[PDB]
Design a protein around this ligand. Sequence first.
Ligand SMILES: N[C@@H](CCC(=O)O)C(=O)O
Ligand SMILES: N[C@@H](CCC(=O)O)C(=O)O
Ligand SMILES: N[C@@H](CCC(=O)O)C(=O)O
Ligand SMILES: N[C@@H](CCC(=O)O)C(=O)O
Lengths: 27, 25, 27, 25, 91, 98, 98, 91
Amino acid sequence: RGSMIRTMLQGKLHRVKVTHADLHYEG
Amino acid sequence: SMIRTMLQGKLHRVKVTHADLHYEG
Amino acid sequence: RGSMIRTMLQGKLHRVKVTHADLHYEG
Amino acid sequence: SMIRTMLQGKLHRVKVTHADLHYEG
Amino acid sequence: XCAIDQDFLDAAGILENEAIDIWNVTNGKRFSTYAIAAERGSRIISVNGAAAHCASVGDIVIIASFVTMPDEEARTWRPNVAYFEGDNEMK
Amino acid sequence: XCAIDQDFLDAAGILENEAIDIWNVTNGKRFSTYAIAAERGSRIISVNGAAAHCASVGDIVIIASFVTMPDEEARTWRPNVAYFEGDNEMKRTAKAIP
Amino acid sequence: XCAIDQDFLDAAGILENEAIDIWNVTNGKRFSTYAIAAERGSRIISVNGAAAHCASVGDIVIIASFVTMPDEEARTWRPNVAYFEGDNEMKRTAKAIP
Amino acid sequence: XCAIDQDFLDAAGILENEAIDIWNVTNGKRFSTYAIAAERGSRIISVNGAAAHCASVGDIVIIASFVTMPDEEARTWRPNVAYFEGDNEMK
Ligand SMILES: N[C@@H](CCC(=O)O)C(=O)O
Ligand SMILES: N[C@@H](CCC(=O)O)C(=O)O
Ligand SMILES: N[C@@H](CCC(=O)O)C(=O)O
Ligand SMILES: N[C@@H](CCC(=O)O)C(=O)O
């Protein structure tokens, strides 16, 4: 009860390359 | 015990209609 | 159990003026 | 039910000793 | 802060006084503030206070809120999305 | 960080060591730090440490704290708001002010 | 926002609609958005919406998610890490890579 | 990311893989990353990956972590602070 709660790295994609960029994305 | 932060909702591509630097509220 | 948790404005100081600035603060 | 976000701890005025843009870990 | 037509808050599940992220498609700025209700049907999106430095009238923005929940629930969670065009016409 | 008169903390419901967001109305800078109590009645707002790059003496700022709670409580939640004018003179309403 | 091959999401333990941080190694920009699933095997990383101001095709990024948990679980927690090279070729270790 | 002498993590209660905020006193930049342990006694503070764009060797920084807890506990909570001078000499 009342426990102190940490924010932890859950997971990561390390050094993936961006494949597409869409400013006008409609979703 | 693992708590995730999730998108609750969004307003997609709304336009700003007014800007009020001096707002009092 | 499993309730969805919101992040809400708890309170605010509205349009307070900064009185001091101390880059080299030691606390 | 109201949960606060609190400073847990801090390292005050440490100096950066190394920078590694190409880190692999 | 950002005042938002109540109909739009209703559609997105965003609450008055909730933390919101604003992502400005026009100028790329990203900031975090809280939501205020504007009159239903007004179609208003008003950036108030310091946030006025981050958006101008006519800028296109995305306004988002986030919630926390356990992983088991998060796996099937569905966000509330409302889509706009033109002069803040929903759909 | 930001040292704040304890009376101002009480009015806004902000706790010593609580995370705070500071939104600078004068210069538009937005940053996150934590609250330090200053002496009651001092009317101090002191930006300390790296935060001193983001605000100057005389700047007008909004200092906010956020808390988490379930949806049902969130739907009727009332934030604690304090309004200022003049020499960091505190009021309970908006609404009064030049 | 950021659409990401579902295989990459599985490897990192990231969920559709989860908040993610994106740290751009190429240009130094740092931003927070949410994850969208792209088709399995597509190898897609697509920055959509306002996020397209912060990353370009070819940029190298780190995409992270954070979760909350009590201290005792945090002290033995192991993040799910996926390492990439080449044509978004995924590896389980660091450690292999040019 | 940021690799930090384990003694320093021990003093501040900061965990390996915990979210941390870095506030750069020298150049004013502010960013968020996660902690990695460096060898105990090395006195290392290494900014890795994208974070290298935000700090240079010799910059003075403040590194902080935050936790959540109920209001009743938060009222008496005490953070773990370690103070440094010179070449990362604690105290
Ligand atoms: N200055 C706040 C506005 C909040 C308020 O109106 O008090 C913002 O900047 O985002
Ligand atoms: N430098 C921190 C806070 C720590 C302190 O100086 O008291 C701030 O930058 O916002
Ligand atoms: N514009 C948002 C996400 C919403 C979308 O375009 O799918 C981003 O900016 O990061
Ligand atoms: N690029 C991360 C480093 C994390 C990692 O090493 O994967 C940062 O920018 O803060």
